RNA sequence: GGUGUCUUGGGUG
């Protein structure tokens, strides 16, 4: 490489936010009793506002 | 209609009415108590 | 074939 690279060890952390806990998609699913609109929640297979 | 005040399920066998339903029930109790005063003795400090 | 409601607290953008 034409340029030299700053290189060495550094202490890194594994944070609790993983993509697989956030990825959500919904085509059709459960609706609310009162409003008949998509429910709220990734765990409930809801829709986005 | 009940659509405007639908019930819900608490533990698989239980349902509580929506707030509007209990409110209407309280109104009905009040109405019937009113209909128990203009039908018999009512010394003017219970009707109000 | 049909997987419920409201508040408190702690975070992410």
Automatic annotation (TrEMBL), chain A:
Localization in the cell: Nucleus
Highest taxon above the source species: Eukaryota
Family classification: Belongs to the RNA polymerase beta chain family.
Complexes and interactors: Component of the RNA polymerase II (Pol II) complex consisting of 12 subunits.
Function comment: DNA-dependent RNA polymerase catalyzes the transcription of DNA into RNA using the four ribonucleoside triphosphates as substrates.
The protein's name: DNA-directed RNA polymerase subunit beta
Species name: Komagataella phaffii (strain GS115 / ATCC 20864)
Automatic annotation (TrEMBL), chain B:
Localization annotation: Nucleus
Superkingdom of origin: Eukaryota
Family statement drawn from the similarity comment of this UniProt entry: Belongs to the RNA polymerase beta' chain family.
Protein purpose: DNA-dependent RNA polymerase catalyzes the transcription of DNA into RNA using the four ribonucleoside triphosphates as substrates.
Protein name: DNA-directed RNA polymerase subunit
Residues of the full protein shown: 244 to 291 of 1743
């Amino acid at each position: 490489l034409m340029a030299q690279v700053f290189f060495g060890p550094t202490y890194y952390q594994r944070l609790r936010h993983m993509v697989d806990d956030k990825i959500h998609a919904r085509a059709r699913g459960p609706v609310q009793v009162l409003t008949r609109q998509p429910v709220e929640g990734r765990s409930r297979d809801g829709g986005l506002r | 209609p009940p659509q405007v005040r639908p019930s819900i399920a608490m533990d698989e066998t239980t349902q509580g009415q929506d707030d509007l339903t209990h409110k209407l029930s309280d109104i009905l109790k009040a109405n019937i108590n009113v209909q128990k005063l203009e039908m018999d003795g009512s010394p003017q400090h219970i009707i109000n």
